[PDB]
Amino acid sequence: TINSKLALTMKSGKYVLGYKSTLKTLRSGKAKLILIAANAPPLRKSELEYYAMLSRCSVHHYSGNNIDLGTACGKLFRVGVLAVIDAGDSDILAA
Amino acid sequence: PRQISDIKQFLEIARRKDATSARIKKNTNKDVKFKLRCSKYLYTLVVADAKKAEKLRQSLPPDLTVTEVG
Amino acid sequence: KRTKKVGVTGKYGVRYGASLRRDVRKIEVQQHSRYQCPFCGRNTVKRTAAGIWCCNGKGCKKVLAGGAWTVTTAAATSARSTIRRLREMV
Amino acid sequence: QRVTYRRRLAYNTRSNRTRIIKTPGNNIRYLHIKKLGTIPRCGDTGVPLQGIPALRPREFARLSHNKKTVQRAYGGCLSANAVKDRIVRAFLIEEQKIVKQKLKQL
Amino acid sequence: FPTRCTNVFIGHKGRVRCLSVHVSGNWLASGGDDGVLRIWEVMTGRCVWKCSLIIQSLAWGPLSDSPVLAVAVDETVYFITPPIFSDEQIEASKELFTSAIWRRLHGGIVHATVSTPSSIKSLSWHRRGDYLATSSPTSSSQAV
Amino acid sequence: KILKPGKVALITRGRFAGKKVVILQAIDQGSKSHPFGHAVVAGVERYPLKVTKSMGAKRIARRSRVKPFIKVVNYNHLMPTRYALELDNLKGLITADTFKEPTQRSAARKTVKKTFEEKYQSGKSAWFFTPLRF
RNA sequence: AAUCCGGUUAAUAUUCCGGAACCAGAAGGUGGAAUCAACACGGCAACGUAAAUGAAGUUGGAGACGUCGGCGGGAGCCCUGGGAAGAGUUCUCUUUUCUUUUUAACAAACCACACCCUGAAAUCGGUUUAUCCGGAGCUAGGGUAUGGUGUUUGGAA
C-alpha cells in the first residue's frame, strides 16, 4: 500500500528527490511528508527528523533500502530521502 | 640572493651598520647592477638608466666602501 | 567467451588438478566480487584481507567484519537470527 | 658522463636519495636530497588536511602559526566535513538527552 | 592654511556620497543617496543646476574643452554634459565616443549610458579622457 | 519558514563553526551579491566564562564580558534549532549598507555586544550563551 | 636539524681559499601588529592574511613503510634545425665532418586529484590505455587547497 501510494503521488502531486532538495523544502516549510530510506546514515536521519519536527512534518522510514525506494519511485537511481510537497490524487498525507 | 626593486630601501640597507661594502657591475647589455654586501644577505639592485645609476652612486654615503667591476 | 569452463582459474594453468582448482574457482569469484554495502547501498564493498570488507564509497568508508571469502556467511546469518529471536523472547 | 655519490653511503636507500644537476662549470653531478614531506591527515576520516604545506616533521617548526593550521574549530586537526559531523552529531545527541530527561522526569 | 569653513552648501536632503570639481574649478558637481545632482559655483555658492535627473560617485573629465561628467547610479553610468557650459563644449564632448552594454527632463543632455552586471562603486578617468575604470566590490572576476 | 528572525541556529561552516547565532534577518529569496538563500546572523565568538558564587565582583564582570560577531551565512551552513532568542533593541540595525560601510558594521557589533551583555546578566537564554562542546 | 658553486695541492677537500648560503640554540634591542569592547579581521563556503597570548590534562598527525603492472609530468643524458668560433678532409664530392656553445645550493614572485558554492540530472550522462562516478547532488559555470627536479629574476658572469 505504501509503495502504490508513493507511485501515485509522484504521478499526481508535487515531490522532490534527494537530500539537499528535501532539506531546502523543509527549510521553506512547504514540505508535507518526508520519506527516509532504511540505510540513511544515522546522523542524516536524525538531522532530517529534527528539521521535520521544527517544520511540523510527518516522517516515514521506508523499510527498504535507498535502492528499494528509488525502484519503488520507478527512477533508475537510488534515492535516500525525498520530500512530498503535495499528494495530489493520492492520500499519502492522511495515512 | 636578495633582489631589491626599491632604490631608497637599497640606500637604507646601505646606511645600515650591517653593510660592509658595495659593488658596481656594468653588463654588456648596458644595465648597471648595484650589489651591497651585508652581514647575512647580498642585496642587488638592477637599474636600466645610466644617469639614475650615477646619481644613485653619489647618493651612497662616503663611509661605505665602493668597489668597481671585479 | 575466452574460457568456457576454467574461468578465473585459467591463471593456474594445467597444474593442481581439476577438482582442486574448481573449488578455488567458486571461492575465488566470491572473494574478488564486489558486494552491495549494507550502509550506503553502493556496490563498492571489496575484500581487503581475510575477513575484512571495506567500502570505498565517498562518505561511507565503512569497514566490515565478515567471512574469509564472502561478506555474509550462512553460519553468521543463522547466529544473527537466533540471537534476534532469543533477545525478543527474553 | 657518469656520476658518483657525494657521501660515503653506497647502496641507494631511502636516505640515499639523489638528483642530477649541471653545474656552472659544465659538470654532471649528483645532489643528495631529502625525502618528501607529508600533508597532515585528518584525525577521524584520515584524509589529508587542506591548507597546510607538505614538510618533514622538524621543518614544520619553522613555519608561522597560521601556516600550519586553519582558522576553524579543530582546524588543522580535522577536515571541514569531519568538524561539521562533530557539530551536528553533538547538537542532535544533546537534544536527545534533554528530551529523554524530560520524558523520564515525569 | 586651510582654516575653518566659511562657505556652506545646503540643499541635499540626505548623505552626499560623492562630489567632484571641474578642471576650471568654477563648477562642483555633487550627488548622494537622494539621487539629486547639484552643480555649485564656488564664488557665490548658488545651486544653479537643481536638476536631479542612489548616486554612488561622479567624476569630471580631464579635458577642459570637453566638460563631461560620469555618474554611477546603481549599476548604470551616465555621461552627462550639462548645458551650463558654452555650446562648443557640448559639441566637443560628443566626438570622444560618438561586456558592459552601451546605450545612446530639465536640460537632460544625456549622451551615453553604460549598464554593468554589478553596482559600480568607484570611478576613475584616464588623463586623456578615453579610458573609464569602473570598480564594483560584489563581483570578483569582472569587478573592475 | 523555520529560519525566522529570532530563531537560534548553529553555524556549521566557516571560522565560527559550532557557534550559536540568532537569525537577525532572512533573505531566502537571494540577492545580487549573494544569489543563494542567505540569512544575516549575530552570534558569540568568545563565550563568557563560567562564574562562581565565591568569585568577587570584578572577576564576575571580567569573566562575563562577551565578544560577539555579525555574519551573513548560507542556509546550508546554518543548523536551525528549536530555541528562540528575544532580540529586543535588535530589530532594525542590519541592512546591506550596514555591511557595505563597516562603520555601521562596527556600530552593529557594539550594539550586539551591549545587548548580549545585558541579556547574559539578566540570566535569560542560558543555553544560547553556554558553549557547545564537540 | 642544517652547504652549494668556482678554484687550489707533488699528495687533502661538499673539510682548505674566494664567493654565496643554511640550521639549532641564547639574550636583550630597533620596527610593526593586537590590547580599557583584555586576547586581529575577511570569505556564503572550501579557506586566506606580516603578526593575531593559552598552564595542567587529553587527543590527533608527521616520522611510518609490501609487491607487481601499465599511464601521465619533470630533470639529466640521447637525438636534432640554424648561428658563431676553431680544427679534420678536399684529385673529385660534400652551404659538411668534428669539438665548443655551461648556470649550483639558497632567496623571491608566479603556476590545476581532493574540497566548497550555484544547480537539480532518464532521450541518463561524465570519463579512462585500463569502467569507474553520480539525487549520499552527475555534467556543467565559478572557486579553494597542495607548488618543483617548472617558469622569471637574484646568485651570475
Experimental technique for the deposited model: cryo-EM
Exposed, middle or buried by CB within 10 Å (0-12, 13-18, 19+), for A80? buried
Q: Residue F103 falls within a domain, yes or no?
A: yes
Helix, strand, coil share of chain F (percent; to 5): 30, 25, 45
Axis crossing angle, helix A2-12 with helix A66-73, rounded to the nearest 10? 50
Angle at E12 between CA E11 and CA E16, to 5 degrees: 140
Q: Residue F48 falls within a domain, yes or no?
A: yes
Domain ranges of chain A: 1-95
**How many residue pairs bridge chain A and chain D with CB atoms within 8 Å of each other?**
9
Domain co-membership, D43 together with D10: no
Axis crossing angle, helix B50-59 with helix B7-15, rounded to the nearest 10? 30
Contacts of A54 in chain D (CB under 8 A): none
User: Residues B61, B15: contact at Cβ < 8 Å?
Assistant: yes
Domain co-membership, D53 together with D99: yes
Q: Is A62 helix (H, G, I), strand (E, B) or coil?
A: coil
Alpha-carbon gap: C23 to the closest alpha carbon of chain A (Å):
33
Contacts of D95 in chain F (CB under 8 A): 81-82
The domain total for chain F is 1
Dihedral sign for Cα E37, E38, E42, E43, please: positive
**Partners of residue F46 on adjacent β-strands:** F67
Alpha-carbon gap: F57 to the closest alpha carbon of chain D (Å):
31
Q: From the CA of D22 to the C1' of G99: give the distance in Å.
A: 20
Q: Note whether D95 contacts A47, CB cutoff 8 Å.
A: no
C-alpha to C-alpha distance for F49 and F91, rounded to whole angstroms: 27
Query: Quick one: how far is CA C1 from the chain centroid?
Result: 24
C-alpha to C-alpha distance for A65 and A71, rounded to whole angstroms: 10
C-alpha to C-alpha distance for E81 and E88, rounded to whole angstroms: 11
Residue D19 contacts by C-beta under 8 Å, 6 or more apart in sequence?
D30, D31, D32, D33
Q: Which domain holds residue B45?
A: 1-70
Residue F129 contacts by C-beta under 8 Å, 6 or more apart in sequence?
F20, F44, F47, F48, F66, F116, F119, F120
HSE-CB at C67 with a 13 A cutoff on CA atoms is: 15
For residue E37, give the C-alpha cell: 545632482
Q: Residue F85 falls within a domain, yes or no?
A: yes
The domain total for chain D is 2
**Given the DSSP bridges, would you call strands B42-47 and B2-3 parallel, antiparallel or unpaired?**
parallel
What is the experimental resolution, given in Å to one decimal place? 3.1
Among chain C residues, the shortest Cα distance to A66 is held by C41
Q: Is F120 helix (H, G, I), strand (E, B) or coil?
A: helix
Q: Which residue has the cell 559550532?
A: F18
End-to-end CA distance of chain E: 37
Instruction: Write out the E strands in chain B.
Output: 2-3, 21-26, 32-37, 42-47, 65-67
C-alpha to C-alpha distance for A17 and A85, rounded to whole angstroms: 11
The domain total for chain B is 1
Domain co-membership, D29 together with D68: no
Phi-psi region of E24 (alpha: psi -120 to 50; beta: other; left: phi over 0): alpha
For residue D49, give the C-alpha cell: 588536511
Task: Report which secondary-structure segment, H or E, holds C19.
Answer: helix C18-32
Q: From the CA of C36 to the C1' of G136: give the distance in Å.
A: 15
End-to-end CA distance of chain D: 89
C-alpha to C-alpha distance for F91 and F115, rounded to whole angstroms: 12
Q: Which domain holds residue D14?
A: 1-36
Q: Residue F1 falls within a domain, yes or no?
A: no
Other Cβ atoms within 10 Å of F38 Cβ, number: 23
Task: Report which secondary-structure segment, H or E, holds E110.
Answer: strand E110-115
Instruction: Label residues C7-19 b or e (16+ Cβ within 10 Å = b).
Output: ebbeeeeeeeeee
C-alpha to C-alpha distance for F27 and F6, rounded to whole angstroms: 14
C-alpha to C-alpha distance for B38 and B13, rounded to whole angstroms: 8
**Partners of residue E57 on adjacent β-strands:** E72
Q: Which domain holds residue F106?
A: 6-134
User: Residues A80, A40: contact at Cβ < 8 Å?
Assistant: yes
**Partners of residue D24 on adjacent β-strands:** none
| Encoded amino acid at E111, one letter | H
Q: Which residue has the cell 640572493?
A: B1
C-alpha to C-alpha distance for A33 and F73, rounded to whole angstroms: 27
Among chain F residues, the shortest Cα distance to E54 is held by F97
Of F68, F107, F111, nearest to F90 (Cα)? F111
For residue B16, give the C-alpha cell: 645600515
